[PDB]
Design a protein around this ligand. Sequence first.
Ligand SMILES: *[C@@H]1O[C@H](CO)[C@@H](O[C@@H]2O[C@H](CO)[C@@H](O)[C@H](O)[C@H]2NC(C)=O)[C@H](O)[C@H]1NC(C)=O
Ligand SMILES: *[C@@H]1O[C@H](CO)[C@@H](O[C@@H]2O[C@H](CO)[C@@H](O)[C@H](O)[C@H]2NC(C)=O)[C@H](O)[C@H]1NC(C)=O
Ligand SMILES: *[C@@H]1O[C@H](CO)[C@@H](O[C@@H]2O[C@H](CO)[C@@H](O)[C@H](O)[C@H]2NC(C)=O)[C@H](O)[C@H]1NC(C)=O
Ligand SMILES: *[C@@H]1O[C@H](CO)[C@@H](O[C@@H]2O[C@H](CO)[C@@H](O)[C@H](O)[C@H]2NC(C)=O)[C@H](O)[C@H]1NC(C)=O
Ligand SMILES: *[C@@H]1O[C@H](CO)[C@@H](O)[C@H](O)[C@H]1NC(C)=O
Ligand SMILES: *[C@@H]1O[C@H](CO)[C@@H](O)[C@H](O)[C@H]1NC(C)=O
Ligand SMILES: *[C@@H]1O[C@H](CO)[C@@H](O)[C@H](O)[C@H]1NC(C)=O
Ligand SMILES: *[C@@H]1O[C@H](CO)[C@@H](O)[C@H](O)[C@H]1NC(C)=O
Lengths: 324, 232, 83
Amino acid sequence: NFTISVTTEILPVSMTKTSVDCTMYICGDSTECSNLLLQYGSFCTQLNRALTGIAVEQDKNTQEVFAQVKQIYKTPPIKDFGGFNFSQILPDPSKPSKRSFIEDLLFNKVTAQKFNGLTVLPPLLTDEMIAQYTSALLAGTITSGWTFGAGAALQIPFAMQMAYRFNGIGVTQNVLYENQKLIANQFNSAIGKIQDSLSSTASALGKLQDVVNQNAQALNTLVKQLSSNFGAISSVLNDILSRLDPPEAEVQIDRLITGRLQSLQTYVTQQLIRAAEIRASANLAATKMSECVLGQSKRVDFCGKGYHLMSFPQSAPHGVVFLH
Amino acid sequence: LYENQKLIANQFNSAIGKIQDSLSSTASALGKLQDVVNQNAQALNTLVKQLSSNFGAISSVLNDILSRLDPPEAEVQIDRLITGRLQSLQTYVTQQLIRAAEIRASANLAATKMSECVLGQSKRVDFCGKGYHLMSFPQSAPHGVVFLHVTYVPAQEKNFTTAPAICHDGKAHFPREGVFVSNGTHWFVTQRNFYEPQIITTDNTFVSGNCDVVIGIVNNTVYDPLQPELDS
Amino acid sequence: VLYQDVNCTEVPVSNVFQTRAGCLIGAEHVNNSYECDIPIGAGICASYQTQTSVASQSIIAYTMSLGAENSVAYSNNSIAIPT
Ligand SMILES: *[C@@H]1O[C@H](CO)[C@@H](O[C@@H]2O[C@H](CO)[C@@H](O)[C@H](O)[C@H]2NC(C)=O)[C@H](O)[C@H]1NC(C)=O
Ligand SMILES: *[C@@H]1O[C@H](CO)[C@@H](O[C@@H]2O[C@H](CO)[C@@H](O)[C@H](O)[C@H]2NC(C)=O)[C@H](O)[C@H]1NC(C)=O
Ligand SMILES: *[C@@H]1O[C@H](CO)[C@@H](O[C@@H]2O[C@H](CO)[C@@H](O)[C@H](O)[C@H]2NC(C)=O)[C@H](O)[C@H]1NC(C)=O
Ligand SMILES: *[C@@H]1O[C@H](CO)[C@@H](O[C@@H]2O[C@H](CO)[C@@H](O)[C@H](O)[C@H]2NC(C)=O)[C@H](O)[C@H]1NC(C)=O
Ligand SMILES: *[C@@H]1O[C@H](CO)[C@@H](O)[C@H](O)[C@H]1NC(C)=O
Ligand SMILES: *[C@@H]1O[C@H](CO)[C@@H](O)[C@H](O)[C@H]1NC(C)=O
Ligand SMILES: *[C@@H]1O[C@H](CO)[C@@H](O)[C@H](O)[C@H]1NC(C)=O
Ligand SMILES: *[C@@H]1O[C@H](CO)[C@@H](O)[C@H](O)[C@H]1NC(C)=O
């Protein structure tokens, strides 16, 4: 005797596409400060280039991990899935978007930064169309088996799909054919349990909350570094401009600007490593999205604790979750 | 395959031709390699261009500063200029190491793709390429590799009325590997990823249990091969 | 030209179209969707169109079609097999 034990695995796909405009962050929109910043040379252009590169990387991460299927699919309205109830994961009309109750539970379990040149560039894919991609992927993996990822979709009964997944694992389809009702009940119980777990404890959803918090703390420290003097005698550059004269103001602002630029350099480097790690995890997520979302992987304990059967993707703030 | 060998070869060579034309048509089809080379050369260009900046010192030409000022003040002047150049070179080196790690990850991915799409056949869908995968032909490129993935993709499909199983004596029949479909009144069993007529026999399908408990089963004949032979 | 957080009234102090990413100046909005080329933001995405009647060259900025929306016709006992 056996069981079906759904499980959520959560992977980030992209941080917030934070940008920087050097002339206003480092320099308090002053003239002498702009002259000095250009006197240091081509640092500022290099910084803006690195940040826009990171933004492009986030765009590519999301597009490559999600939009693996060209055509956007539409789930047939009827639900006669041999007893399997997909209400929690299939799209619901009355919701603000074409979302599902699973990501509706997810959204709420996720957690000053402007006017200082820190422009949070908008994400390319808004939440509605990401949910549309997730809906299309779910429809493909329900009503088209593993075929729709390969080429065009194929009408496939759900019992047939699950039986073929069994046969791929090694258990023969006789078991499913003799137990269909019990298997549907098992999956419904498991989905209820995972719904309760996600509705009660957010401690499992640690990855996305932690990465967003890490980015937020890094940016907050980046902003808070402005108040520091870095050896200079005044925090605000305007106070230096007030009475200090160019013979001394040049050296004072030189110290202050080299300190601020060093802080910005540290921040951009930290963002570079974190974005590289996120892109590595995003390639992992895409390879999951290909290996068993659009099929099933005979390899063990990659996308499921035990003999894997199938997977359902769901969107989340800056991340994806898999119901294995 | 042996039913369609010439057709397979014809499609293969036409695909080779379309690859030739697609590559020779536009430059941006080959984009990743150009991206990497441009990024490296442009970063190095920024590095070398950075030498023109005085960094707050008297000038950028170091020999001019050597000629102009005395060592007791060239001390501080060159100190400022050297610390500026040092900072620029340091950030260049850090970004170079970042891109080196990224390229190393891409190279490991390429090693996996080479050891799977070439040294074998990886069933993992959409790893080698779109559709099921057959093989891949590596080819060199200046600082990079390119893969010619050979894929199998369904092209023309016809939907059929199918059944989860059949039972001849109440005992259910489940295909050894096939799908019970019916062109018309005549049922047929065929492998999932192609169409192949097959008269229902004991070889194509094993027998178990009885068909009261299964769902969607249809009453259908299960012919046998032993009877015609034993008739004589 | 693309603006981020100006609410587009402050641009002068032509054609304006505002998205969650700010407005574009000199941008023809097109309801008819297209798989686009140059991401702008909030899904709004821009490209260039050669016309023949009025303004034979123009820049369009449209909502990004997520793909050719296709609806599979699932049924309990209807399978499709590639031939
Ligand atoms: C195999 O185990 C599963 C669960 O591990 C059993 O399914 C339970 O059956 C009872 C019937 O008395 C139901 O009340 C429960 O809701 C079912 N699920 C669970 C999680 O307990 C099943 O009965 C066992 N036996 C067989 C032959 O499958
Ligand atoms: C799948 O389960 C969901 C969760 O309960 C069902 O949704 C509601 O189900 C109750 C009864 O269980 C109905 O009174 C409500 O009208 C349902 N609401 C919606 C929005 O559907 C759903 O009916 C179940 N579906 C199947 C096929 O069992
Ligand atoms: C569906 O395809 C089969 C493929 O041969 C057609 O042929 C029939 O095959 C069965 C074998 O069980 C014979 O009993 C029939 O006499 C065959 N039909 C002929 C010869 O016309 C079958 O006819 C096709 N059915 C439809 C409705 O097109
Ligand atoms: C396959 O044939 C069997 C023959 O027994 C059918 O079973 C009978 O079905 C009738 C209704 O058509 C019932 O009144 C009887 O009680 C059933 N008897 C038994 C022993 O099962 C069965 O319904 C047929 N199934 C299909 C799909 O045609
Ligand atoms: C097969 O698909 C076509 C559309 O492609 C549809 O019109 C037809 O009703 C389908 N027939 C069956 C038996 O599934
Ligand atoms: C622009 O400002 C107005 C102020 O009344 C505000 O209501 C509106 O939401 C802003 N954005 C627009 C019009 O896109
Ligand atoms: C686009 O749709 C809006 C929605 O009401 C409509 O007002 C507008 O006229 C449409 N424009 C074109 C060019 O279709
Ligand atoms: C099964 O499919 C047939 C069409 O082939 C339909 O008439 C019937 O209502 C369906 N029943 C169930 C339970 O899915």
